[PDB]
Design a binder for this molecule. Structure first.
Ligand SMILES: CCCCCCCCCCCCCCCCCC(=O)OC[C@H](COP(=O)([O-])OCC(O)COP(=O)([O-])OC[C@@H](COC(=O)CCCCCCCCCCCCCCCCC)OC(=O)CCCCCCCCCCCCCCCCC)OC(=O)CCCCCCCCCCCCCCCCC
Ligand SMILES: CCCCCCCCCCCCCCCCC[C@@H](O)O[C@H](CO[C@H](O)CCCCCCCCCCCCCCC)COP(=O)(O)OCC[N+](C)(C)C
Ligand SMILES: CCCCCCCCCCCCCCCCC[C@@H](O)O[C@H](CO[C@H](O)CCCCCCCCCCCCCCC)COP(=O)(O)OCC[N+](C)(C)C
Ligand SMILES: CCCCCCCCCCCCCCCCC[C@@H](O)O[C@H](CO[C@H](O)CCCCCCCCCCCCCCC)COP(=O)(O)OCC[N+](C)(C)C
Ligand SMILES: CCCCCCCCCCCCCCCCC[C@@H](O)O[C@H](CO[C@H](O)CCCCCCCCCCCCCCC)COP(=O)(O)OCC[N+](C)(C)C
Ligand SMILES: CCCCCCCC/C=C\CCCCCCCC(=O)O[C@H](COC(=O)CCCCCCC/C=C/CCCCCCCC)COP(=O)(O)OCCN
Ligand SMILES: Nc1ncnc2c1ncn2[C@@H]1O[C@H](COP(=O)(O)OP(=O)(O)O)[C@@H](O)[C@H]1O
Lengths: 347, 459, 121, 320, 98, 69, 56, 104, 49
């Protein structure tokens, strides 16, 4: 596919997200979602194969149903109050429809089924885009209307997302499905604090995006999509595997790494309200995510797996194209906790 | 106190820029200098702490622990530099980096003046230890040992974080001084019951309490010798430090919430002590003895009397030194015969006499021979327990007899009898090993010369 | 939520005018030194990933890394300080304007207050 | 500017440098055929670039200094041991076959990169499309197992599908008694142990499978031993061909851009050679892997990137 | 709420249920999506006509435009599915199960 | 030893007093901030939790072809 | 002789320099907690005619 | 191949006493080995152990144990001189304490 | 040596080096001048100096 067309499609996806972000009219936010989906469908299909076609079809169907529910909620809100502005959302039925539509767009449980399959069916670049940039617009809309969030519904979906992500990741051998399930669990953590503090949501989103970008660029540097193909990397790029292990530990939420900062803050926030049981359950459930991160670390960095003879040839060649911002993203993904108070510059 | 913290962060680049054949020399020399510097914290006041800054402080409970940590790092280096001879320079520097990071995290942990920072460093200690165990362990059980260690710790430690943020929101501060001065009684409520459990269970697991102790044999047996030393000597005492710091806010609920744990600590004391009588693996025997001693310390903290606290501090220090020495002694035989079975190499007193006397002195210290600090701590705890209830003496005396039984049993099995006939690769003891044993054991006796330095703030 | 809608707030300013009435962070601020350390670590990781001598491969690019991190960190610290100052200002003004919600209670000495005693035994 | 999307968006197109004489040519034949000399003559007459047949140490010639490395560090297989003990239990036969296939894949990528960057044509002494004749020869003679054949077919399926077959396929047909006589007259003691059944299997694989398969997508010009010496006749036969049946006439600028992005980045080329299939012949344990990799890193110019090795005379490092 | 509004909302609910249930064909699901578009258009038009929102009258038109886009997208995808299998059966789209 | 390596007790005493004052002030400030946040979120009369309302500058005050608007 | 041994053993000054820096930093830190210097009820004393601070 | 890997055989232990009969067990190189022994012995036994123990044994009484003894001696002498009970069961003066007026 | 020309030239890319050093010095000078400006402005506003 032509580089100019690829640039135009990426710019259209980004412009749709920005249009959702900068709009005060419900119709314009809907149009931004439509433009985003329209330009995103071919990017998932850049490398043509039946699996990519499957993933594109499933993504399209899910997002189209979500768009229908979004527009229906907007129209019901207009009927019960002649307001087009994105605000408190005076109607509760329309509010439930909107919350469900945005949850389906994000992939929150029980609307999570499409994320692992779409992630596994596309390339690592499309997976990076899907799991990082596609989460901005629905979260922005949810942040703007948090005053009318039904805490029961949103918190139920968030706890379900954390549980389902943790459990589903345990069974996975492919790396893209592992990333998808980690994404679902992190989305649950992000939306759990939404009715209480959107600043914590934005902080968790930024930390998650940094960690996910680091993980995906590491997986692209070492062209590995399975556990066993990543088991070979130590024999060619030991430094890459060490950095990957530290990044995985950070995503597991262990201090003093960066991945500890969001959940920590989130817990504190819910403890400023009463909300004692939920943060405890979320921590004990994030234990599962840490478990399968540690399993990946055992396979890739803390043990040396058997290799093949042809690997010797690869010892003689360097990387033709180097991904910029990878060192910066690794550093921001690991050694950033001491700068925790700077989150005050987020509200 | 940055005069101790900064030199370790300088140990880091000095190690990473030293040439290939002088990493061990530089690390040992400067670690010993840092321990000499940290020795200045033993000049403690009599009424309050040493409040260096808004973030760091020291009292007479954390000063001996800091000295123990700084002293243990050079011993770990000397014991490690033998089995890593065939390792590449980069991974040797990585191992030394792991040890240095562990010591730095422990140094900040023992002196953090507020509970959230203490929690952050107390959990940060997990990463270097896990990496050490699961990367430089020898057998294939090191992966499961690391998993058990990590998840046992985190399962008990996450509710502690929830309870800590709850306490900070309710009271307004988590600084130890403000927490102690503004302390209020805890009412008998279900909410208070679960707050007590959340505050206590992390340190219970770190001791470990009997019942939650199944991670310790795996972790201490599968680890390399430096990992075993740091686990037994220092990392087990984080639970005791946290317990004796956080119990100031749990009164008077403790008076009736300690009843289960006390039982688990008392009867468990017997059970683990009996396991050592039938252990076919030396490292597992040492690990189970550590479990029983820590159970005694848990009793001391739970009954919450000044004599009990002094005994707990003395026992923590004494057990750290003794268990480190025992692990090193067992490792010498392991490097000789490449097997951990106790009955494999027998009658070693004939072939290694000086190592035999090291074994004897370590075993004598382990079974609390007077006037060692081991006996001082155990006896103070026993007297406090007798004041608590006169029926405890039965369990304590049973434990004393079983401890002597298994200590001398291990000594007789390894050192006495006749040598195994086919084992002919037992070379004379090196200067490094004998120096390591002497550097373990001389501080113990020098400390029983002046015991008030390890008796805690209640002295 | 709490601070997004505040009267007299320019949308995308990142540094309001009133922020200049606050002391600027010193150039030796430990947070700035930590940002410089983060830049140094990024430079070293960049050297290691491209298979170059880690300490001494590219000094110019390492200097650019450190200076970029310090540069961004200075304004980040300024904005963080300003937002905390705003929080304190608003809280104090709210306390001052609603006296009945924050009344100064009577001062009692420990000689008058009766605390229950719980013996340890 | 190194070639990439930016060099394609502005300017560089590869169809403006194809001048109808590109004609990627591979010469083929049995063992001890005059295909090497014929390939050299064709290359110098048509003005193309000749690629000597890829051996064990081909990749060493294109990296660092062109000098070959130790067999323990590159290859880990020898052809002499295959001729001596083809049925050895250390797996030398299939290890050699797979290393040779990877070398041929790398050489094909290099030839395609040169063709697409300069437009000048190339001549090859064999290709990845004909390497299977030796594999079939080993399998029929019992040298390798069926699992090795399956692994070879998997790697070939995931690798060779991404490239364009050669325009012209040249075959030199020398019968088995003649090549046996040439081997006897050669003087290499190890080649003297090649049984006639092995060469017969090679010839059967060539004639029954390779030529019919390449007929439907390439121009096949068979020859005989006598016709090979007069290479001017072969060159004028090539000059009057109609390259109309393959996939080359259907190549646009976008497909060529994708192929040119693929042929560089040799790591991407070799990606699927080391798939995690654990055949005992080619699987290497963790300890041996670590030892040999550490030994490789210790080589004089191999520790750092090709511009940052001080010990081979690279200066101004701190300013790069 | 008048009864016509109730009928339009019921039509939308029926179309949504029809989409969320798949029988075999993808074309039928695309038809259900188009029906949801049609019901949304009628609902918006009725609301904008009853309350004389003059500037909102272009809003349904824009809606229709993006409707086509979705339709176009779906149709494109359907072609590819057919080209891989010869039928538009959703049961063939099961590769990502493993 | 005391002269070379250590200081008097007054230094540590008064440093402890200053530290205690700072931490007590911080605790009282945290509790006050929590109470203020609760009140502001409950009432909406403060500078915080000011959710947007429609700008009144958008309204058109002109004759509307019909006297009754 | 000085150049080679210096380039070999310059790493032996990192820890002493670190300790000196830590001492200086501790002095800087405890010079910020003087809000009660010579103001305590137990240690309030009259300054000598030549000195200016009870402790540094 | 009747095997599973191309794996190196397990090497046998290298006895340090073989090449260096007086080896100290620190390193293979005799010079670095001897100097490692020397630095360990000097900085462990000579500097830290003995000098540190001497420093600990002469630490100034910041714990105020002789001060408390002198204070107790003065108090006891004073209270015996005037026929006082030598210690009161009330730690604080009851006059400065305001009990609740009634518990009935 | 190296059979290939080692794309990264054995001599440094003086254009890239110059531009990198130049932006480093420019950023440092700008930061120093900005810090001076905020110090002066803060002192002026609060009546200090
Ligand atoms: C809190 C206090 C401070 C601590 C902060 C945190 C730690 C420090 C910052 C961390 C980041 C810094 C650098 C990162 C990149 C470096 C990577 C690397 O490989 O380095 C190689 C390099 C040596 O290699 P080389 O010389 O190029 O040639 C050898 C070949 O490269 C040979 O290359 P190779 O290919 O053969 O190497 C293969 C090897 C290579 O594998 C690695 O090297 C591991 C890479 C580390 C991962 C870093 C990720 C991000 C950092 C996170 C740290 C987390 C800390 C929190 C605690 C949790 C711990 C995980 O992989 C393996 O063999 C497998 C081993 C598996 C073990 C698994 C453990 C790995 C994770 C450990 C992370 C812990 C931090 C390590 C810090 C130091 C490491 C160099 O190391 C260095 O030289 C750099 C050291 C630091 C330089 C400082 C010097 C400055 C001047 C000194 C004087 C100071 C001031 C003077 C003024 C005073 C007045 C006089
Ligand atoms: C492997 C080892 C791990 C460590 C084990 C730790 C053990 C933790 C147990 C802590 C003991 C105290 C918990 C409950 C406190 C009271 C005990 C109970 O009997 O309550 C009685 C009440 O009667 C009933 O028992 C009530 C509780 C009934 C439900 C609890 C049964 C749970 C079964 C044990 C599970 C095993 C623990 C491990 C879980 C994974 C007391 O009567 P009452 O004076 O009116 O209430 C006093 C408390 N108030 C005032 C706050 C109300
Ligand atoms: C791991 C670290 C991840 C950080 C992510 C990348 C770090 C670099 C960030 C890039 C900085 C440039 C962004 C903006 C600069 C100019 C634009 C300016 O106008 O933005 C204004 C203010 O700038 C941004 O809002 C703040 C960006 C600051 C990001 C740093 C905080 C990171 C979290 C703490 C972790 C510690 C990291 C330490 C440094 C690495 C927006 O005002 P406002 O219209 O009202 O916001 C609307 C949305 N709100 C109200 C809901 C927030
Ligand atoms: C007359 C004496 C007879 C008996 C001698 C007894 C032996 C005692 C000596 C043992 C010393 C133990 C080390 C403890 C050092 C304390 C460090 C720290 O606490 O003190 C610093 C004091 O600085 C000192 O100068 C520390 C110097 C000690 C350095 C020890 C290095 C010894 C290592 C020797 C190894 C040999 C090297 C050669 C290699 C072959 C604090 O600095 P500062 O906060 O500002 O000052 C506050 C106090 N003031 C204000 C009153 C001055
Ligand atoms: C191989 C040959 C064996 C046989 C030959 C033996 C040779 C002769 C030995 C026999 C003599 C026995 C010694 C008799 C006791 C005399 C020493 C005593 O006076 O010193 C003690 C003092 O001992 C020291 O306090 C011991 C120091 C404690 C250990 C220092 C730590 C070293 C660093 C190692 C790290 C350890 C980490 C563990 C946590 C701390 C008394 O304490 P104290 O009455 O008050 O001080 C007296 C001075 N005053 C009056 C001014 C106060
Ligand atoms: C190696 C395994 C170790 C396992 C240890 C994990 C269990 C530790 C004990 C339970 C910890 C949960 C405590 C939650 C945090 C405490 C905070 C708190 O106490 O606040 C209370 C809140 O108290 C709670 O809500 C506690 C709810 C507990 C739910 C989590 C269940 C976890 C399992 C419970 C049974 C097991 C506990 C002991 C098991 C020991 C391990 C064998 C007051 O809040 P308010 O709502 O404002 O009430 C006052 C105003 N009305
Ligand atoms: N895939 C292969 N498997 C086994 N041997 C091979 C393979 N490819 C080439 N060889 C060996 O390489 C040797 C030299 O190749 P060849 O071209 O036939 O000789 P020459 O260069 O003299 O013409 C031959 O003995 C041939 O057997």
């Amino acid at each position: 596919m032509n580089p100019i067309i690829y640039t135009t499609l990426i710019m259209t996806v980004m412009s749709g997200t920005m249009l959702v972000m900068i709009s005060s009219h419900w119709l314009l936010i809907w149009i931004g979602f439509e433009m985003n989906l329209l330009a995103m469908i071919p990017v998932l299909m850049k490398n043509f194969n039946p699996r990519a076609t499957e993933a594109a079809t499933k993504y399209f169907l899910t997002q189209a149903t979500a768009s229908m529910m979004l527009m229906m909620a907007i129209i019901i809100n207009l009927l019960y109050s002649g307001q087009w502005t994105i605000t408190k959302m005076f109607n509760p039925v329309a509010m439930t429809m909107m919350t469900m539509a945005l949850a389906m767009k994000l992939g929150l449980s029980p609307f999570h089924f499409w994320v692992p399959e779409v992630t596994q069916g596309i390339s690592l670049q499309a997976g990076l885009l899907l799991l990082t940039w596609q989460k901005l617009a629905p979260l922005s809309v949810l942040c703007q209307i948090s005053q009318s969030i039904n805490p029961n519904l949103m918190l139920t979906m968030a706890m379900l997302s954390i549980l389902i992500g943790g459990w589903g990741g345990l069974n996975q051998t492919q790396l893209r499905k592992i990333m998808a399930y980690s994404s679902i669990a992190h989305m649950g953590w992000m939306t759990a604090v939404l009715p209480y503090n959107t600043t914590m949501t934005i902080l968790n989103l930024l930390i998650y995006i940094t960690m996910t970008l680091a993980m995906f660029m590491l997986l692209i540097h070492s062209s590995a999509t399975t556990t066993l193909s990543l088991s070979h990397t130590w024999n060619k790029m030991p430094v890459i595997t060490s950095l990957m292990m530290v990044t995985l530990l950070s995503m597991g939420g262990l201090p003093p790494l960066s991945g500890f900062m969001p959940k920590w803050m989130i817990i504190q926030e819910m403890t400023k309200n009463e909300s004692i049981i939920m943060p405890t359950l979320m921590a004990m459930t994030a234990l599962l995510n840490l478990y399968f991160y540690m399993r990946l670390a055992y396979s890739s960095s803390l043990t040396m797996f058997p290799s093949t003879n042809n690997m010797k040839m690869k010892w003689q060649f360097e990387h033709t194209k180097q991904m910029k911002l990878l060192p910066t993203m690794i550093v921001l993904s690991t050694l950033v906790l001491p700068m925790t108070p700077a989150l005050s510059s987020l509200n | 106190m940055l005069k101790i913290i900064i030199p370790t962060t300088m140990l880091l680049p000095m190690t990473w820029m030293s040439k290939h054949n002088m990493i061990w020399i530089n690390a040992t020399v400067h670690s010993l200098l840092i321990s000499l510097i940290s020795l200045s914290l033993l000049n403690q006041l009599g009424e309050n702490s040493l409040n260096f800054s808004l973030t760091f402080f020291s009292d007479s409970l954390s000063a001996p622990l800091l000295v123990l940590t700084t002293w243990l790092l050079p011993l770990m280096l000397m014991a490690s530099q033998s089995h890593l001879s065939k390792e590449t320079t980069t991974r040797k520097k990585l191992y030394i980096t792991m040890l240095i990071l562990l010591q730095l995290f422990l140094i900040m942990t023992f002196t953090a003046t507020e509970l959230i920072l203490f929690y952050i460093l107390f959990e940060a200690t997990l990463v270097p230890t896990l990496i050490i165990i699961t990367r430089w362990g020898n057998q294939t059980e090191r992966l499961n040992a690391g998993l058990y260690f990590l998840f046992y710790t985190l399962a008990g430690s996450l509710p502690l974080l929830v309870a800590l943020v709850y306490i900070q929101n309710t009271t307004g501060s988590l600084n130890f001084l403000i927490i102690h001065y503004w302390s209020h009684p805890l009412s008998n409520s279900w909410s208070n019951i679960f707050m007590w459990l959340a505050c206590i269970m992390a340190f219970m697991v770190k001791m470990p309490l009997y019942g939650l102790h199944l991670w310790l044999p795996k972790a201490h047996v599968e680890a390399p010798i430096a990992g075993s030393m740091v686990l037994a000597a220092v990392l087990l005492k984080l639970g005791g430090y946290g317990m004796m710091r956080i119990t100031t806010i749990l009164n008077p609920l403790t008076n009736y919430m300690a009843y289960p744990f006390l039982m688990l600590s008392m009867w468990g004391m017997i059970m683990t002590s009996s396991i050592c009588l039938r252990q076919t693996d030396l490292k597992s025997l040492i690990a189970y003895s550590s479990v029983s001693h820590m159970a005694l310390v848990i009793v001391a903290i739970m009954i919450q009397t000044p004599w009990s606290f002094m005994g707990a501090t003395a026992l923590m220090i004494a057990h750290g030194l003794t268990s480190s020495m025992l692990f090193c002694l067992a490792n010498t035989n392991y490097e000789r015969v490449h097997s951990r079975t106790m009955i494999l190499a027998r009658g070693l007193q004939t072939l290694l006499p000086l190592m035999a006397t090291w074994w004897l002195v370590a075993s004598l210290t382990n079974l609390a021979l007077p006037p060692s600090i081991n006996l001082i701590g155990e006896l103070f705890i026993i007297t406090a327990s007798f004041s608590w209830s006169n029926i405890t003496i039965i369990l304590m005396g049973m434990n004393m007899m079983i401890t002597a039984l298994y200590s001398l049993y291990m000594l007789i099995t390894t050192q006495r009898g006749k040598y195994t006939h086919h084992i002919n690769n037992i070379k004379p003891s090196f200067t490094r090993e004998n120096a390591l044993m002497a550097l373990h054991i001389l501080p113990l006796l020098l400390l029983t010369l002046n015991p008030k330095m390890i008796l805690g703030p209640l002295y | 939520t709490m601070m997004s809608g505040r009267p007299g707030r320019v949308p995308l300013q990142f540094l309001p005018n009133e922020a200049r009435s606050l002391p600027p962070p010193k150039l030796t601020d430990p947070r700035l030194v930590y940002m410089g350390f983060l830049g140094y670590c990024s430079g070293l990781i960049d050297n290691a990933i491209r298979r170059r001598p880690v300490v001494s491969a590219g000094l110019h690019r390492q200097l650019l890394y450190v200076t970029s991190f310090v540069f961004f960190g200075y304004y980040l610290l300024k904005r963080q300080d300003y937002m905390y100052a705003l929080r304190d200002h608003d809280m104090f003004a709210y306390v001052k304007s609603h006296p009945e919600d924050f009344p100064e209670k009577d001062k009692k000495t420990y000689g008058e207050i009766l605390e229950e005693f719980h013996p340890v035994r | 500017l190194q070639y990439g999307p930016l060099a394609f968006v502005l300017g560089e197109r590869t169809t403006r440098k194809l001048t109808e004489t590109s004609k990627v040519i591979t010469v083929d034949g049995n063992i001890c055929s005059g295909k090497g000399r014929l390939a050299r003559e064709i290359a110098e007459k048509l003005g193309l670039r000749h690629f000597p047949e890829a051996g064990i140490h081909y990749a060493d010639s294109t990296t660092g200094d062109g000098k070959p490395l130790d067999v323990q560090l590159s290859g880990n297989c020898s052809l002499e041991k295959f001729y001596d003990d083809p049925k050895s239990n250390d797996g030398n036969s299939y290890r050699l076959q797979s290393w040779l296939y990877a070398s041929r894949l790398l050489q094909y990528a290099d030839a395609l990169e040169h063709l697409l960057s300069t437009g000048q044509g190339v001549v090859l002494e064999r290709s990845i499309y004909s390497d299977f004749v030796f594999l079939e020869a080993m399998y029929r003679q019992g040298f390798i197992r069926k699992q090795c054949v399956e692994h070879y077919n998997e790697v070939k399926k995931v690798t060779a599908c991404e490239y364009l077959p050669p325009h012209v396929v040249v075959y030199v047909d020398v019968p088995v008694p003649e090549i046996q006589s040439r081997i006897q007259k050669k003087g290499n003691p190890h080649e003297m142990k090649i049984t006639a059944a092995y060469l017969q299997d090679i010839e059967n694989a060539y004639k029954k499978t390779f030529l019919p398969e390449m007929s439907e997508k390439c121009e096949v010009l068979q020859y005989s031993a006598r016709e090979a010496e007069d290479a001017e006749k072969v060159v004028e036969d090539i000059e009057y061909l109609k390259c109309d049946k393959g996939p080359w006439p259907d190549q646009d600028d976008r497909t060529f851009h994708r192929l040119r992005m693929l042929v560089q980045n040799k790591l991407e080329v070799l990606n699927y050679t080391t798939i995690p299939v654990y055949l005992p012949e080619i699987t290497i344990g963790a300890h041996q892997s670590d030892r040999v990799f550490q030994k490789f890193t210790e080589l004089p110019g191999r520790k750092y990137s090709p511009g940052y090795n001080e010990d081979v005379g690279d200066k101004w490092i701190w300013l790069k | 709420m008048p009864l016509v509004y109730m009928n339009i909302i019921m039509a939308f609910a029926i179309a949504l249920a029809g989409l969320l249930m798949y029988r075999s064909h993808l074309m039928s699901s695309l038809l259900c999506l188009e029906g949801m578009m049609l019901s949304l258009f009628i609902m918006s038009t009725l609301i904008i006509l009853n309350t004389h929102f003059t500037l909102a009258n272009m809003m349904p038109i824009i809606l229709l435009v993006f409707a086509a886009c979705e339709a176009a997208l779906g149709l494109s995808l359907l072609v590819m599915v057919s080209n891989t299998y010869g039928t538009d059966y959703v049961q063939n789209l099961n590769l990502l199960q493993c | 030893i005391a002269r070379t390596f250590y200081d008097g007790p007054e230094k540590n005493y008064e440093k402890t007093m200053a530290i205690l004052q700072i931490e007590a002030e911080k605790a009282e400030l945290r509790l006050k901030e929590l109470e203020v946040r609760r009140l502001m979120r409950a009432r909406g009369d403060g500078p915080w939790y000011q959710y947007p309302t429609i700008d009144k500058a958008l309204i058109d005050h002109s004759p509307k072809t019909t006297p009754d608007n | 002789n000085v150049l080679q041994i210096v380039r070999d053993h310059w790493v032996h000054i990192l820890v002493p320099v670190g300790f000196v820096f830590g001492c200086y930093l501790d002095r800087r830190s405890d010079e910020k907690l003087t809000a009660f210097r010579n103001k305590s009820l137990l240690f309030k004393r009259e300054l000598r005619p030549n000195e200016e601070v009870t402790w540094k | 191949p009747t095997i599973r890997l191309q794996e190196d055989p397990d090497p046998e232990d290298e006895n340090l006493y073989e090449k260096n009969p007086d080896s100290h067990g620190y390193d293979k190189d005799p010079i670095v080995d001897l100097w490692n022994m020397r630095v360990v012995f000097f900085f462990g036994f000579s500097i830290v152990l003995v000098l540190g123990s001497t420093f600990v044994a002469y630490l100034p009484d910041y714990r105020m144990q002789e001060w408390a003894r002198r204070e107790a001696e003065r108090l006891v002498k004073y209270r015996e001189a005037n026929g006082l009970p030598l210690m009161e069961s009330n730690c604080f003066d009851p006059n400065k304490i305001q009990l609740p007026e009634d518990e009935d | 040596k190296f059979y290939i020309r080692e794309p990264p030239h054995g001599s440094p890319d003086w254009l890239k080096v110059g531009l990198t050093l130049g932006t480093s010095v420019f950023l440092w000078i700008y930061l120093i001048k900005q810090h001076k400006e905020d110090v002066l402005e803060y002192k002026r506003r609060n009546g200090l100096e």
